[PDB]
UniProtKB/Swiss-Prot annotation, chain B:
GO cellular component, one term: DNA replication preinitiation complex
Alphabetical keyword list: DNA replication, Nucleus
PANTHER family given in the database record: DNA REPLICATION COMPLEX GINS PROTEIN PSF2
Protein name: DNA replication complex GINS protein PSF2
TM ranges: none
Family: Belongs to the GINS2/PSF2 family.
Described purpose of this protein according to its UniProt entry: Functions as part of the GINS complex which plays an essential role in the initiation of DNA replication by binding to DNA replication origins and facilitating the assembly of the DNA replication machinery.
GO biological process: DNA-templated DNA replication; double-strand break repair via break-induced replication
InterPro entries (alphabetical): GINS_A (IPR021151), GINS_bundle-like_dom_sf (IPR036224), GINS_Psf2 (IPR007257), PSF2_N (IPR056784)
Subunit structure: Component of the GINS complex which is a heterotetramer of SLD5, PSF1, PSF2 and PSF3. Interacts with PSF1 and SLD5.
Entries under SUPFAM superfamilies matching the protein: GINS helical bundle-like, PriA/YqbF domain
Subcellular location(s) of the protein: Nucleus
The organism's place on the tree of life at top rank: Eukaryota
Curated annotation (Swiss-Prot), chain C:
Superkingdom of origin organism: Eukaryota
Shown residues within the full chain: 15 to 164 of 971
Further remarks about this protein from its record: Present with 35100 molecules/cell in log phase SD medium. Early fractionation of eukaryotic MCM proteins yielded a variety of dimeric, trimeric and tetrameric complexes with unclear biological significance. The MCM2-7 hexamer is the proposed physiological active complex.
Subunit composition and interactions: Component of the MCM2-7 complex. The complex forms a toroidal hexameric ring with the proposed subunit order MCM2-MCM6-MCM4-MCM7-MCM3-MCM5; loaded onto DNA, forms a head-head double hexamer. Interacts with CSM1.
Gene name of this polypeptide: MCM3
Primary role: Acts as a component of the MCM2-7 complex (MCM complex) which is the putative replicative helicase essential for 'once per cell cycle' DNA replication initiation and elongation in eukaryotic cells. The active ATPase sites in the MCM2-7 ring are formed through the interaction surfaces of two neighboring subunits such that a critical structure of a conserved arginine finger motif is provided in trans relative to the ATP-binding site of the Walker A box of the adjacent subunit. The six ATPase active sites, however, are likely to contribute differentially to the complex helicase activity.
Family membership noted in the UniProt record: Belongs to the MCM family.
Protein name from the UniProt record: DNA replication licensing factor MCM3
Protein localization: Nucleus
Organism ancestry: Eukaryota, Fungi, Dikarya, Ascomycota, Saccharomycotina
Curated annotation (Swiss-Prot), chain E:
InterPro entries registered for this protein in UniProt: GINS_A (IPR021151), GINS_bundle-like_dom_sf (IPR036224), GINS_Psf1 (IPR005339), PSF1_C (IPR056783)
Organism: Saccharomyces cerevisiae (strain ATCC 204508 / S288c) (Baker's yeast)
GO cellular component: CMG complex; DNA replication preinitiation complex; GINS complex; nuclear replication fork; nucleus
Protein name from the UniProt record: DNA replication complex GINS protein PSF1
Assigned protein family: Belongs to the GINS1/PSF1 family.
Complexes and interactors: Component of the GINS complex which is a heterotetramer of SLD5, PSF1, PSF2 and PSF3. Interacts with PSF2.
UniProtKB/Swiss-Prot annotation, chain F:
Gene Ontology CC, one term: nuclear replication fork
Protein name as catalogued: DNA replication complex GINS protein SLD5
Top-rank lineage group of the source organism: Eukaryota
Protein species of origin: Saccharomyces cerevisiae (strain ATCC 204508 / S288c) (Baker's yeast)
Family: Belongs to the GINS4/SLD5 family.
Pfam family, one: SLD5_C
Gene3D superfamilies assigned: 1.20.58.1030, 3.40.5.60
Main localization (coarse): nucleus
BP term (GO), one: double-strand break repair via break-induced replication
Localisation: Nucleus
Gene name of the record: SLD5
Subunit structure comment from the entry: Component of the GINS complex which is a heterotetramer composed of SLD5, PSF1, PSF2 and PSF3. Interacts with PSF2.
Length: 190, 192, 105, 171, 197, 243
């Protein structure tokens, strides 16, 4: 299915590169301007994604936990294509969503909304300290020092159970110098 | 007597006004060449002769503001210049990607004229206009990368920018001139 | 890149830095002779040197930015060079410490 | 220029002056007209006055001690991280004052360092000037750290970019 | 110290320049600071009396070649500083008045000093002399946006009845809309009776 | 084969309003971008103003004819032509009046200096002279009554060069400007004495940056950011024009 994922990625790349209203390429402009001020994210209004090609929105809303990382990947590739002269390094870009889907009040959310994109509102009653989550883990086997890696999308991974070619039962460890991390924060919404 | 924002630069409308003085090729949809077998254009800034001798769909060359005036009505079509076709813009894009330092030799008015004609003559292009807009955007983005590289090499001495557009220059002008002026004033002040 | 290959270059570059700014060698020997004298007649100073990041910047900006951005690769050879210098002074690992102008850090 | 307001304010900043003579009557600079200023009185004077008493006097009436804004501490902070530096806190007119100081005493090191400082900050200033809405907090936290000189360059540059974007995409 | 009031005045100058610069319109400039200017001119008179007192006492001549020279230098430089501050303030407000003259009167009064009121009168008279002698074929006070269109649509924003133009009329009915030559209506756009472009 | 293009040239050989408008555009661009007040195009402006007068009379006469074969479209083109041209003259004059405002005391000094290589009536228009003189008097009257009345006679001069700051603002001669190198306006590269071959066999002008004691080769058909004083005589001879 990697060809299918590649076609999802290329579909999103085409959405960034082609979406235009009133003579302005709004997402090319926004992505470039975001790169200049060195915030590596893109704010996408899903009204525009629906208006471009609703098949993409249908894929996104059917399973966002698989589709959102592909959209993020597409944003990285376009970011490089519009800010670096290739044949003469940026992180994984965050996707940010704007929406006007009808709100589900916080009490009505239940088991039928699991893994759906949801829009809600409330009062933030607490905001935890920042915490570090891994995006890229550099990984080493404790016995043979076979090295590998895990590239992580934070939408829901673990260390491998045994060595990927005796080598011990549960052998892998993290190389904390080469591994890449991101800020994560917890909020409570009432 | 001159506003602050016009003191040492041109407004983009003045850049447009400059570009509108360029000749452009049109297909007339009126005939003004009276046969041998009435009001004449009688201009004082530009070539009166071409407009008095138009014949419908014999292509001819006139100043761009007159072509826009005739294209505000249905009385001509503006022939997009040869560089603005898809294949030529793609060649310029390949040049830009192949030479990381040089700017490609697009004409000085390229962004201004692309904007003007994509708005006022969107129907006259042989190629699909969304591709022309896409490739003009590709060129502006790639050229902006090259500009941002070039500004790392600002001097107290001078600078060279071979094929940078009138609009791109006019957009950069206050920044570049002010920064190079201050670098000069730092350097000259240090002299005995 | 494998750090172990360039480790020797980093050791000799920090040794050149120590030679260039001799006040660090003088401080190393000051610590040593103080400890020797306290051992000589029955207080001990530690095997630590505070180096200026400004001196290291003016010496080698590439090494200095290596210390700031990649200390896990640049501190151990710098401390090895310091330990070798202390060992070259007449008659245990020596440690580095830092001062000045960290900027964004 | 003469009527240039940001120059007039820059001339109004104060520098530490050490006097080379005993002079009667000047005690109003020490807030008492009735007494002399002594030799080796160390006194903060406005630059419009200190510039002239530093040259006229033969030994001049005043020697200018190194101001703290050009101390080796500040110069080191400049030479590490130009874009992270809060020049507006150091002195709101630091570039104009550095130009004046470089001219008053020919100091090649300060000229080189200030050239590097301005150039490296000019890159970041252009990045924030070119970015446009369709404003970012990253821009706001950077603009707080700009001198009046750099604020004028940023305003003019950002207006140029904004006006161009307006003309391109609007009618 | 003698220069402090000058700093306060040119801080006023800097703030009014920003007040004019930040907005898109011509903001009507703020009140002329007669109080601070009176304080500075009184300080100048103090400094003049100090020079007179010193130059009288130079006939007694206390270490005059250095001491009286130095005293005279400092009290002269205080007057140079205060002259610079005063002229900076007045030159800024003069520039704004000239800009306003071209932008409006060549086609809030309490805030001006009476010298500035009669200055503005004379500068407007000068502008109207320039667009009356030679070069009168061009209204030199007209717009500096280049003419983008020869015909425009304009919506009547305030009623002004039937008025003539060179070969016709407009009846400026409230919330009527014309389609008309721009050169025949620009005067009314500037006067705020017509809305568009 | 034997080349004959010169033979064919000698077979082939067997002021205009368009040129004046192009010259006005050149003057307007150079004026807008330069720090100096450039010398007034006396004859060009005289003839342009005559044309604007006669063209206005023509458009009016045709309008009277319409009121007394008919198509209005050329008439519309003539109307908007005069609008565009009168805009350029308006913008040009307004700009150099702003320069006269900035440099009023420096221009007065140039008129005072009997050794000046420029007389003010070379540099300025008659209307600009009217403006400079009477604006200078009116500004002088304002600051005389408001400020200089109260100063000592050491300091009542409005233009003191010996002060702790020079009161006379002058053009920033080494201001950086953008230029595009024309070459000679005719294609007579062999006639131009300053034009010369660069390496890689292409023409250029070499100029000296005197502070840096350094030379730079301004190639034809390319754009440079240059100190204005360095390029100034090339600009005077139209060998470069300001972007
Ligand atoms: Zn293993």
């Amino acid at each position: 299915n990697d060809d299918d994922n590649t076609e999802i990625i290329k579909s999103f790349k085409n959405f960034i590169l082609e979406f235009r209203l009133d003579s302005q390429f709004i997402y090319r402009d926004q992505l470039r301007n975001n790169i200049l001020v060195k915030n590596y994210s893109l704010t996408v209004n899903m009204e525009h994604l629906i208006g471009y090609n609703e098949d993409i929105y249908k894929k996104l809303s059917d399973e966002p936990s698989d589709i959102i990382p592909l959209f993020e990947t597409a944003i990285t590739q376009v970011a490089k294509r519009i800010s670096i002269l290739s044949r003469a390094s940026l992180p994984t870009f965050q996707l940010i969503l704007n929406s006007n889907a009808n709100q589900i009040p916080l009490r009505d959310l239940d088991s039928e909304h699991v893994s759906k994109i949801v829009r809600l509102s409330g009062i933030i009653i607490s905001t935890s300290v920042l915490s570090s989550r891994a995006t890229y883990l550099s990984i080493m086997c404790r016995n043979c020092r076979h090295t590998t890696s895990i590239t992580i999308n934070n939408f829901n991974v673990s260390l491998p159970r045994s060595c990927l070619s005796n080598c011990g039962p549960d052998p892998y460890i993290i190389i904390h110098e080469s591994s890449k991390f991101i800020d994560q924060q917890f909020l409570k919404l009432q | 007597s001159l506003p602050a924002h016009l003191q040492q630069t041109f407004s983009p409308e003045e850049i447009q006004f400059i570009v509108e003085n360029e000749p452009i090729k049109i297909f007339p949809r009126i005939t003004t060449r009276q046969k041998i077998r009435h009001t004449r254009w009688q201009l004082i800034t530009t070539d009166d002769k071409a407009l008095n001798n138009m014949v419908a769909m014999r292509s001819t060359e006139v100043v761009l503001w007159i072509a826009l005036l005739l294209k505000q009505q249905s009385k001509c079509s503006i022939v997009a210049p040869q560089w603005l076709t898809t294949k030529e813009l793609d060649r310029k894009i390949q040049y830009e990607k192949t030479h990381p330092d040089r700017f490609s030799e697009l004409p000085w008015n390229w962004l201004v004229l692309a904007r003007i004609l994509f708005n006022k003559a969107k129907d006259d292009f042989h190629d699909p206009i969304h591709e022309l807009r896409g490739k003009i955007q590709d060129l502006r983005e790639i050229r902006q990368i090259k500009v941002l590289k070039g500004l790392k090499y600002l001097n107290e001495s001078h600078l060279q920018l071979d094929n940078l557009s009138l609009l791109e220059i006019n957009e950069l002008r206050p920044f570049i001139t002010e920064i190079m002026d201050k670098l000069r004033e730092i350097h000259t002040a240090s002299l005995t | 890149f494998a750090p172990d290959a360039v480790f020797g270059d980093r050791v000799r570059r920090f040794q050149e830095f120590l030679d260039t700014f001799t006040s660090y060698r003088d401080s190393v020997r000051s610590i040593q002779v103080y400890n020797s004298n306290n051992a000589a007649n029955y207080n001990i100073l530690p095997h630590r040197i505070i180096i200026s990041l400004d001196d290291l910047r003016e010496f080698d900006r590439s090494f200095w930015s290596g210390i700031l951005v990649e200390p896990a690769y640049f501190i151990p050879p710098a401390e090895k060079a310091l330990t070798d210098l202390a060992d070259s002074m007449d008659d245990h690992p020596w440690k580095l410490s830092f001062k000045g102008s960290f900027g964004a850090h | 220029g003469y009527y240039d307001i940001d120059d007039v304010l820059a001339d109004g900043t104060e520098f530490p002056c050490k006097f080379q003579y005993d002079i009667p009557g000047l005690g109003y600079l020490e807030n008492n007209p009735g007494r002399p200023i002594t030799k080796n009185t160390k006194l903060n004077l406005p630059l419009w006055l200190a510039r002239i008493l530093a040259i006229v006097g033969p030994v001049p009436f005043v020697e200018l001690l190194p101001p703290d804004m050009f101390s080796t501490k500040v110069m080191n902070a400049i030479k590490t991280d130009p874009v992270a530096l809060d020049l507006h806190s150091i002195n709101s007119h630091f570039f104009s004052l550095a130009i004046k100081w470089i001219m008053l005493f020919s100091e090649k090191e300060l000229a080189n360092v200030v050239s590097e400082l301005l150039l490296q900050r000019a890159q970041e200033l252009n990045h924030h000037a070119s970015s446009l809405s369709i404003t970012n907090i990253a821009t706001s936290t950077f603009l707080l750290k700009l001198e009046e000189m750099e604020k004028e360059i940023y305003k003019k540059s950002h207006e140029s970019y904004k006006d161009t974007k307006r003309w391109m995409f609007k009618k | 110290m003698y220069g402090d009031l000058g700093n306060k005045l040119v801080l006023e100058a800097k703030r009014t320049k920003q007040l004019y610069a930040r907005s898109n319109q011509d903001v009507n400039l703020p009140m002329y600071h007669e109080d601070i200017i009176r304080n500075i001119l009184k300080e100048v008179s103090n400094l003049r009396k100090n020079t007179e007192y010193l130059k009288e006492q130079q006939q007694l001549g206390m270490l005059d070649d250095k001491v009286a020279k130095c005293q005279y230098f400092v009290t002269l430089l205080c007057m140079e500083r205060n002259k610079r501050c005063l002229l900076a303030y007045q030159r800024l407000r003069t520039d704004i008045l000239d800009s306003m003259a071209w932008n409006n009167n060549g086609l809030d009064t309490n805030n001006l000093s009476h010298q500035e009121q009669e200055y503005l009168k004379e500068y407007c008279d000068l502008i109207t002399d320039l667009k009356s002698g030679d070069l009168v074929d061009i209204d030199l006070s007209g717009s500096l946006v280049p003419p983008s269109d020869v015909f425009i649509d304009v919506r009547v924003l305030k009623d002004a009845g039937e008025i003539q133009t060179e070969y016709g009329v407009f009846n400026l009915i409230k919330d009527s809309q014309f389609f008309v030559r721009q050169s025949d209506v620009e005067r009314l756009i500037q006067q705020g009776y017509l809305q568009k472009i | 084969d034997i080349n004959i293009d010169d033979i064919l040239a000698e077979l082939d050989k067997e002021v205009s309003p368009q040129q004046d408008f192009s010259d006005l555009m050149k003057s307007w661009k150079n004026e807008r971008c330069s720090p100096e007040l450039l010398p007034y195009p006396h004859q060009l402006m005289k003839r342009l103003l005559n044309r604007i007068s006669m063209q206005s009379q023509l458009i009016e006469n045709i309008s009277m004819g319409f009121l007394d074969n008919e198509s209005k479209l050329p008439l519309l083109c003539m109307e908007t032509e005069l609008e565009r041209l009168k805009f350029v003259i308006r913008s040009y004059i307004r700009c150099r009046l702003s320069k006269i405002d900035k440099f009023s005391l420096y221009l007065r000094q140039l008129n005072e200096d009997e050794n000046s290589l420029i007389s003010l009536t070379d540099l300025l228009s008659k209307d600009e002279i009217k403006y400079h003189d009477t604006h200078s008097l009116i500004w002088l009257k304002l600051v005389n009554d408001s400020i200089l009345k109260y100063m000592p006679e050491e300091l009542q001069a409005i233009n003191d060069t010996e002060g702790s700051v020079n009161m006379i603002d002058e053009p920033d001669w080494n201001k950086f400007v953008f230029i595009h190198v024309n070459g000679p306006p005719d294609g007579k590269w062999n006639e131009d004495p300053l034009l010369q071959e660069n390496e890689f066999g292409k023409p250029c002008y070499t100029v000296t940056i005197p502070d840096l004691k350094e030379e730079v080769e301004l190639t034809i058909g390319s754009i440079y950011v240059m100190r204005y004083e360095v390029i100034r005589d090339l600009l005077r001879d139209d060998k470069v024009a300001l972007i």
